[PDB]
Amino acid sequence: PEVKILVDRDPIKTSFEQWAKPGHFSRTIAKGPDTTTWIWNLHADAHDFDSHTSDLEEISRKVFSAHFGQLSIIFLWLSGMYFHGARFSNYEAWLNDPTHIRPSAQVVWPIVGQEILNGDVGGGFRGIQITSGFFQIWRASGITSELQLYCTAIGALVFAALMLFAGWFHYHKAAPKLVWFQDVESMLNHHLAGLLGLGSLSWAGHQVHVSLPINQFLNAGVDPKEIPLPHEFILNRDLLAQLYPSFAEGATPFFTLNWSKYADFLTFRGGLDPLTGGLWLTDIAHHHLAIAILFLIAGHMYRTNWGIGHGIKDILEAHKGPFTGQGHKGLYEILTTSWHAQLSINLAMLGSLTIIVAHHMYAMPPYPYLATDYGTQLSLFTHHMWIGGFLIVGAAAHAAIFMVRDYDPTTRYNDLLDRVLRHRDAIISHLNWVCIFLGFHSFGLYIHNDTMSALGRPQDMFSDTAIQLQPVFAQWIQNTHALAPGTTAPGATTSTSLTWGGGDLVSVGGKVALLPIPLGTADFLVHHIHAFTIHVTVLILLKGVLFARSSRLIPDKANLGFRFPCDGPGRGGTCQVSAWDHVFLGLFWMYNAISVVIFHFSWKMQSDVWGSINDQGVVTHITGGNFAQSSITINGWLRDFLWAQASQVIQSYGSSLSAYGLFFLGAHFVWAFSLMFLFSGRGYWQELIESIVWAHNKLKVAPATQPRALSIVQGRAVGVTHYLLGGIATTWAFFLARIIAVG
Amino acid sequence: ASYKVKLVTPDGTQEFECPSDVYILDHAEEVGIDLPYSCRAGSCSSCAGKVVGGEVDQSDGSFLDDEQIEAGFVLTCVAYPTSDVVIETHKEEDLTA
Amino acid sequence: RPLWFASKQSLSYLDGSLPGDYGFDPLGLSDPEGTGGFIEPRWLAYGEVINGRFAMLGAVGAIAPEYLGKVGLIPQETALAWFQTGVIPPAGTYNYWADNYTLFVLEMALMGFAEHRRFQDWAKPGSMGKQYFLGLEKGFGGSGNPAYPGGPFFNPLGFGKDEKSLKELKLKEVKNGRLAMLAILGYFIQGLVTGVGPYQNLLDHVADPVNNNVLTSLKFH
Amino acid sequence: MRDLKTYLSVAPVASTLWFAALAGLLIEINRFFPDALTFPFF
Amino acid sequence: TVAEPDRPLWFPGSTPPPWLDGSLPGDFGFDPLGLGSDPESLRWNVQAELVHSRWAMLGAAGIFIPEFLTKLGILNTPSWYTAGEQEYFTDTTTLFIVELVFIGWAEGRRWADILNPGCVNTDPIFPNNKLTGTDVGYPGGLWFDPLGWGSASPQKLKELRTKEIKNGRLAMLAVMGAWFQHIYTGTGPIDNLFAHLADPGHATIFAA
Numbered sequence A: 001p002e003v004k005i006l007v008d009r010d011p012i013k014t015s016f017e018q019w020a021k022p023g024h025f026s027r028t029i030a031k032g033p034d035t036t037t038w039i040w041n042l043h044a045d046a047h048d049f050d051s052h053t054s055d056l057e058e059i060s061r062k063v064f065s066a067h068f069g070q071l072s073i074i075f076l077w078l079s080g081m082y083f084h085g086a087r088f089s090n091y092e093a094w095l096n097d098p099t100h101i102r103p104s105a106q107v108v109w110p111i112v113g114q115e116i117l118n119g120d121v122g123g124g125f126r127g128i129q130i131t132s133g134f135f136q137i138w139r140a141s142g143i144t145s146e147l148q149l150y151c152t153a154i155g156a157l158v159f160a161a162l163m164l165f166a167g168w169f170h171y172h173k174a175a176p177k178l179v180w181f182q183d184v185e186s187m188l189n190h191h192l193a194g195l196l197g198l199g200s201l202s203w204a205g206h207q208v209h210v211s212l213p214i215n216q217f218l219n220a221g222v223d224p225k226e227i228p229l230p231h232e233f234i235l236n237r238d239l240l241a242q243l244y245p246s247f248a249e250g251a252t253p254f255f256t257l258n259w260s261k262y263a264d265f266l267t268f269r270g271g272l273d274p275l276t277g278g279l280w281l282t283d284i285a286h287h288h289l290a291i292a293i294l295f296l297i298a299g300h301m302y303r304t305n306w307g308i309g310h311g312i313k314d315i316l317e318a319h320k321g322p323f324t325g326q327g328h329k330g331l332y333e334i335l336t337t338s339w340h341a342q343l344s345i346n347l348a349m350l351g352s353l354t355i356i357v358a359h360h361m362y363a364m365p366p367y368p369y370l371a372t373d374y375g376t377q378l379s380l381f382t383h384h385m386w387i388g389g390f391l392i393v394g395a396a397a398h399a400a401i402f403m404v405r406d407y408d409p410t411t412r413y414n415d416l417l418d419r420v421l422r423h424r425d426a427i428i429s430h431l432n433w434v435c436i437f438l439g440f441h442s443f444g445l446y447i448h449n450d451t452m453s454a455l456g457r458p459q460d461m462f463s464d465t466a467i468q469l470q471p472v473f474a475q476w477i478q479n480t481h482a483l484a485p486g487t488t489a490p491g492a493t494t495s496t497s498l499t500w501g502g503g504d505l506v507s508v509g510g511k512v513a514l515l516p517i518p519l520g521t522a523d524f525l526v527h528h529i530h531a532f533t534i535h536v537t538v539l540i541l542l543k544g545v546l547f548a549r550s551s552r553l554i555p556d557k558a559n560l561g562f563r564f565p566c567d568g569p570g571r572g573g574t575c576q577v578s579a580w581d582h583v584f585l586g587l588f589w590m591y592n593a594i595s596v597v598i599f600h601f602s603w604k605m606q607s608d609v610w611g612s613i614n615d616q617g618v619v620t621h622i623t624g625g626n627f628a629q630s631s632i633t634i635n636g637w638l639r640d641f642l643w644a645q646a647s648q649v650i651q652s653y654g655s656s657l658s659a660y661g662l663f664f665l666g667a668h669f670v671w672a673f674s675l676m677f678l679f680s681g682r683g684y685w686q687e688l689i690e691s692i693v694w695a696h697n698k699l700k701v702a703p704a705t706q707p708r709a710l711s712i713v714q715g716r717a718v719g720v721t722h723y724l725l726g727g728i729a730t731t732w733a734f735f736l737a738r739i740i741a742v743g
Numbered sequence B: 001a002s003y004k005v006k007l008v009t010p011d012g013t014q015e016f017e018c019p020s021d022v023y024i025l026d027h028a029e030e031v032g033i034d035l036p037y038s039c040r041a042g043s044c045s046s047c048a049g050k051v052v053g054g055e056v057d058q059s060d061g062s063f064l065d066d067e068q069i070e071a072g073f074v075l076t077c078v079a080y081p082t083s084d085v086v087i088e089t090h091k092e093e094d095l096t097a
Numbered sequence C: 001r002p003l004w005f006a007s008k009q010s011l012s013y014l015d016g017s018l019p020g021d022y023g024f025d026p027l028g029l030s031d032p033e034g035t036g037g038f039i040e041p042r043w044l045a046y047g048e049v050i051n052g053r054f055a056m057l058g059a060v061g062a063i064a065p066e067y068l069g070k071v072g073l074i075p076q077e078t079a080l081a082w083f084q085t086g087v088i089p090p091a092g093t094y095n096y097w098a099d100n101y102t103l104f105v106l107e108m109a110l111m112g113f114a115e116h117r118r119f120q121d122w123a124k125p126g127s128m129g130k131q132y133f134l135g136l137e138k139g140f141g142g143s144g145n146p147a148y149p150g151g152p153f154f155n156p157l158g159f160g161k162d163e164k165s166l167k168e169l170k171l172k173e174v175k176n177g178r179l180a181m182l183a184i185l186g187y188f189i190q191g192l193v194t195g196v197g198p199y200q201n202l203l204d205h206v207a208d209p210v211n212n213n214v215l216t217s218l219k220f221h
Numbered sequence D: 001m002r003d004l005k006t007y008l009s010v011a012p013v014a015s016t017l018w019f020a021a022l023a024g025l026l027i028e029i030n031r032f033f034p035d036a037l038t039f040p041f042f
Numbered sequence E: 001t002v003a004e005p006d007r008p009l010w011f012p013g014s015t016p017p018p019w020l021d022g023s024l025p026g027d028f029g030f031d032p033l034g035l036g037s038d039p040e041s042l043r044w045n046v047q048a049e050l051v052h053s054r055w056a057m058l059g060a061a062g063i064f065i066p067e068f069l070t071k072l073g074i075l076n077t078p079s080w081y082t083a084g085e086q087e088y089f090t091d092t093t094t095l096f097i098v099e100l101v102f103i104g105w106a107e108g109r110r111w112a113d114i115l116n117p118g119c120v121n122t123d124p125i126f127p128n129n130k131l132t133g134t135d136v137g138y139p140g141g142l143w144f145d146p147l148g149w150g151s152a153s154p155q156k157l158k159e160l161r162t163k164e165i166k167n168g169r170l171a172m173l174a175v176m177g178a179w180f181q182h183i184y185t186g187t188g189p190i191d192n193l194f195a196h197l198a199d200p201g202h203a204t205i206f207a208a
């Protein structure tokens, strides 16, 4: 009943015995290989711990230490970033003059003439211009020298070592047992209050003492080397009292509850800093303070050892009504015995979170000199969109794996899951209809516009000047937001963003940081295209999950396992009738959706927001509002967006952006290459490998591990992975080359 | 090497000589105590038995439950007798359940 | 035997075989259920005793120099607070016969042999009285109990030849050790948010209590 | 040690070490005799 | 092999590895990474440590005495570190390649016996000369044992071999230290010794 640390001593002895043996976990693998297919299986089931065994304890111990290994990898990556910024960067030069020097923290060796990639990024430096936005983070944290970056790199190196050691320790020396993992009340209490609460309180503590004064000094124009070191701001306090007078009272305001005496550096201004083009740091500090208080209270909800708190089982089984029978009764037993349920929930939430992060970061730029660094903005948005999409697809993959492997109504019965399984056909039919209707009335409008324009009938077109489809709801909402500060958020001075409205354009160094974003008919059309693509990928994934165990087609689909080729060409043909195959499609449709989203973002930003400001306040954008009139027909996307924007990357050869041109072409190649795997089947290939094997045998050079063509599932996997790599990489090259050349 | 192999059987219990590099069922045929079989390739229940003492190598195994290996059952056609083990014959159905 | 804020789970593993056993374990850490690395109860008892011993040493030692810094021939250059000694350079340094880094590595070479030998005795009890160490191994035998090795070195005066002597003496030892541990914690936090030094700070408190903990509420530095 | 020698000769590690050695050799060769479109010695 | 069960260990109180039963000269049970758990590998590494220690003793002499003797004004050997390029009667390449063939043949003879004990012992020109030693790494002979100082019954010889290996380990560390000292500072080893003895508390590696 009570909660304690519970461990096991030396469960597995560290040794090199199993390294010598390839696929020790799989009994069939351990023995050895007869054909080439054995090598592929070895890799495909390396991390599927729940099939190497059946013990939940062993699965969870393996999971814990694998997480430790992953954390170590992440720390090594971070330390590499910091070290490259310390040693092979122009960070100090950029710190002296941010809006003329281009950030770059990677140089290349002059081996085969590749030193042309060491382009002129300014600052007496020649390297590869980076888009990671790391310089902005380091500037917002207060880092002024490269000694601080060196110290950070070494600290992260020793942290990576610590994480690797802890991974070894918690698997080979002191491995917890099942009752320790199956405690989720204390785990939640610690992750809410300890990891997020204390973490954000600690970060607010950093910003209050390091980033606020140092960034004040930097924005006052002081030479970066003439700025006091951060620890001075802690030793000598009147240094802070000068910048921030109310540091004089010194924490007595915090206990007199005269918190208003802190109004100096704990603000609620909102908007952007007109000097840096980022959010006010005195706003971010206040934000993290409030976040910390909220999380610290929130991590006290669940009962662990002292009576007070909430039993999650009680909360769950208290919720049920007349439509759902006994809903939520039995979910606590499901979410604590199967790792795949937890994994899919967390993956869905993390993907949602990543995409929300992308949006909020484009809209409210948090770092100084980030908004006017167009390359960094574009790259960050695109990268986070892709990450979010991939995570969301993985959520569906693991929900299906749960349904196939761990769902059991004999021992772990839940009502809601059962009801959804019982009317899955109604669910999928209505989602099908919605997909069809949405596809007709969003893309059909584009086709109508294209033919109306090609028949010389622009008046009949669905445009801003012929037949207006105005997004009146979005316009109304954003006008409500523009009017918010002072009316219904009285403590704010500026609206939370500048895309809402109110005028108040902000520029930095002759470039536009932000201005109100207008929503017209093209925005309506493309938003409905977005809704359509999201609905279709949801349809595919949900159909895969709901029909993973059985269907009216094949009545015992679970016995065939979560992943399998087919069940023969019977009943008309059952190609890809498995849950894994549904995930394979969803990835295709996720690719489509995210591609359209990032294209929309890039065109709209290069057309209505970014650009150069001038002396009168005349804003010339990258494209003179060509999105409002040209984006309404597909010919406009092919001509004004792809063909026009594509010219930058094509002319990259012979300059320092040549690598982007090379990657453009190479990604085209690998994408086209995927089609060989996606259009063919393994029968032809086995029959061809047969005669190649004959040719080898004729010369006593045939191998003993018999070469087999790939499995049916592996061929689809090779085809989908190559497809995604090709498409994403060509978009990456195009975006980067274009925004670095025109930005 | 050639450890003695004991097999309970409705015919009785006999002892035969056979080298650890060979299957118990294959040398049984050489002596001449008849046992059941069908596929002879380790993929069926026909030649099933279970063990009383010792244990046989599970390397020559396929089409078996991730448990049939350690719960007792085994296939005479695909099995190397690493010791002086005592095994059962005609054991398909109490394996078939 | 009196008990403070005990627990039914805590009482089970805390019956009294250890000195200073007051059944106080509100977070249940000496549980013999989940014994693994560094959570085993014997190791926790050993750690309490060793921390208490080092804390008694450091707690009479950190307050010493600035006391006789007021009484006796002891100069003022030899009269620092415990934080100005060079331990925290950004708070004050000194110039000893060495560098304060060679000082550290010499300190830790000496402490290395002493601590490693002590651990070698914890793990395989009675192993240090076997190998040669310029003689002196017959005195490093041990007594079966790690926290109480005894011998001609660690107990020359022969206190407690009967065992209730040792019982009440161990009780007194661990009590004074807990006192010294929280004394050192007070030293730390007080020297931070008041930044004066404990002895001199105590004298200011004894002038008259106008200068209460709240008074330095304001965190001068 | 014996098992470490074995694992260091497994196919992926053997091939990565082989190809790293080959890459180093070719890189150095073209670092000494760069821009070579022909065989100009004989 | 005299399996010293209670030999003095490097880490008192902890059991030595099984493949280290004290058989080898100066065995103190030091092999944490287990680099010698294979008998063949053990043999090979015994040979390696011996030849390393011998080369390093020759090197420690040739570094530390000439500069300790030219610090005091006896003669004028330049700095051992940059002693490589101070030109001689020929170029370094002619001497290095000439020496490589010379040093190479002897190395080949050692390989011939390390991998096949006692099969190269005799001389290729006058086959009546017969290097003495019966152990690998301890070749004896009139060439390498003219004094016969350690050809006595295997008791003093065993304690003599330990002596050699201990001096050799010290010399390896010494030679590496001189190279590291010469890279960190810009002085000579005797200069570093004299400075650290002039001001021990302050003139150490913690001087930069």
Ligand code: CLA
Pocket (backbone or CB within 6 Å): A064, A067, A068, A069, A071, A180, A186, A187, A190, A191, A193, A194, A195
């Ligand atoms: C305040 C307490 C605390 C804190 C700070 C953390 C923090 C973390 N936990 Mg953890 N956890 C806790 C309590 C805590 N936990 C409790 C009480 C339980 C249940 C008994 C768990 C069970 C648990 C599991 C099962 C897992 C985590 C994981 C993680 C990591 C999540 C990944 C991440 O966000 O990276 C953020 C990166 C950082 C914050 C870098 C700093 C890392 C610091 C040094 C971590 C130190 C905190 C740790 C608890 C110290 C105690 C150990 C100590 C004896 C040395 C993260 C570092 C995941 C993980 O293990 O990842 C490997 C995961 O699998 N936790």
Ligand code: CLA
Pocket (backbone or CB within 6 Å): A043, A044, A045, A046, A047, A048, A049, A347, A390, A391, A392, A393, A394, A395, A397, A401, A563, A580, A583, A587, A721
């Ligand atoms: C926290 C995230 C997370 C975690 C822990 C897991 C964990 C797991 N997943 Mg999974 N998944 C995730 C996210 C995650 N997934 C996401 C986001 C997706 C959507 C793409 C998927 C989709 C997915 C599928 C379809 C499957 C799994 C499967 C599995 C299980 C086995 C994976 C394995 O060993 O295959 C081995 C890993 C590899 C072979 C790596 C392949 C290399 C990739 C494809 C190339 C990447 C290219 C690189 C980025 C750049 C090019 C480099 C090159 C040019 C040099 C395992 C428990 C498998 C399973 O059966 O579950 C039981 C399964 O089939 N996942």
Ligand code: CLA
Pocket (backbone or CB within 6 Å): E170, E171, E172, E173, E174, E175, E176, E177, E178, E180, E181, E184, E185, E192, E193, E195, E196, E203, E204, E205, E206
């Ligand atoms: C072979 C034994 C040996 C000896 C007798 C010395 C002696 C000396 N070294 Mg040296 N050193 C050695 C090995 C040795 N070293 C090795 C292997 C290295 C490579 C890491 C170094 C690298 C080194 C550097 C970079 C420096 C010295 C320096 C010095 C001088 C001052 C010590 C010091 O401050 O630095 C400390 C030296 C070390 C921590 C390395 C010693 C570690 C090995 C294991 C030796 C251990 C000693 C051995 C167990 C007992 C010796 C037996 C007997 C001769 C007493 C001093 C005379 C300093 C100097 O120049 O003086 C101004 C200095 O800058 N040494």
Ligand SMILES: CC(/C=C/C=C(C)/C=C/[C@@]12O[C@]1(C)C[C@@H](O)CC2(C)C)=C\C=C\C=C(C)\C=C\C=C(C)\C=C\[C@@]12O[C@]1(C)C[C@@H](O)CC2(C)C
Pocket (backbone or CB within 6 Å): E030, E031, E032, E033, E034, E035, E052, E053, E055, E056, E058, E059, E060, E061, E062, E063, E080, E083, E172, E173, E175, E176
């Ligand atoms: C040979 C050598 C140096 C030879 C140098 C020579 C000849 C130089 C000759 C000179 O002509 C020059 C060139 C210049 C001339 O003007 C002067 C001289 C000087 C005369 C150093 C070796 C130096 C070699 C060293 C220091 C090796 C150290 C190895 C260690 C510490 C390993 C220990 C462990 O491996 C174990 C045993 C067990 C494992 O489980 C754990 C670990 C810890 C891995």
Ligand SMILES: CC1=C[C@H](O)CC(C)(C)[C@H]1/C=C/C(C)=C/C=C/C(C)=C/C=C/C=C(C)/C=C/C=C(C)/C=C/C1=C(C)C[C@H](O)CC1(C)C
Pocket (backbone or CB within 6 Å): C024, C025, C026, C027, C028, C029, C051, C052, C054, C055, C057, C058, C059, C061, C062, C081, C082, C083, C085, C087, C181, C182, C184, C185
């Ligand atoms: C019991 C319990 C159980 C439950 O369940 C929970 C809870 C409640 C949490 C718990 C706990 C409580 C507490 C309080 C604890 C604490 C402890 C401590 C304080 C320690 C210290 C401890 C402490 C220590 C060691 C210390 C030591 C110190 C020293 C040596 C010092 C030194 C020095 C000197 C001399 C002087 C110089 O100049 C400096 C120096 C160098 C610095």
Ligand SMILES: CC1=C[C@H](O)CC(C)(C)[C@H]1/C=C/C(C)=C/C=C/C(C)=C/C=C/C=C(C)/C=C/C=C(C)/C=C/C1=C(C)C[C@H](O)CC1(C)C
Pocket (backbone or CB within 6 Å): E057, E058, E060, E061, E064, E144, E145, E146, E147, E148, E149, E167, E168, E170, E171, E173, E174, E175, E177, E178, E189, E190, E192, E193, E194
């Ligand atoms: C580091 C440092 C630093 C600081 O500063 C300085 C200093 C001090 C310099 C340092 C230290 C050093 C050291 C320690 C050294 C040591 C060395 C050695 C040990 C050597 C040996 C060495 C040794 C040796 C040579 C030996 C040798 C031997 C021999 C020859 C022998 C020969 C022989 C033979 C065979 C045989 C015959 O029958 C006899 C004879 C003929 C006789």
Ligand SMILES: [Ca+2]
Pocket (backbone or CB within 6 Å): A004, A005, C028, C029, C030, C031, C032, C033, C034, C035, C039
């Ligand atoms: Ca415990």
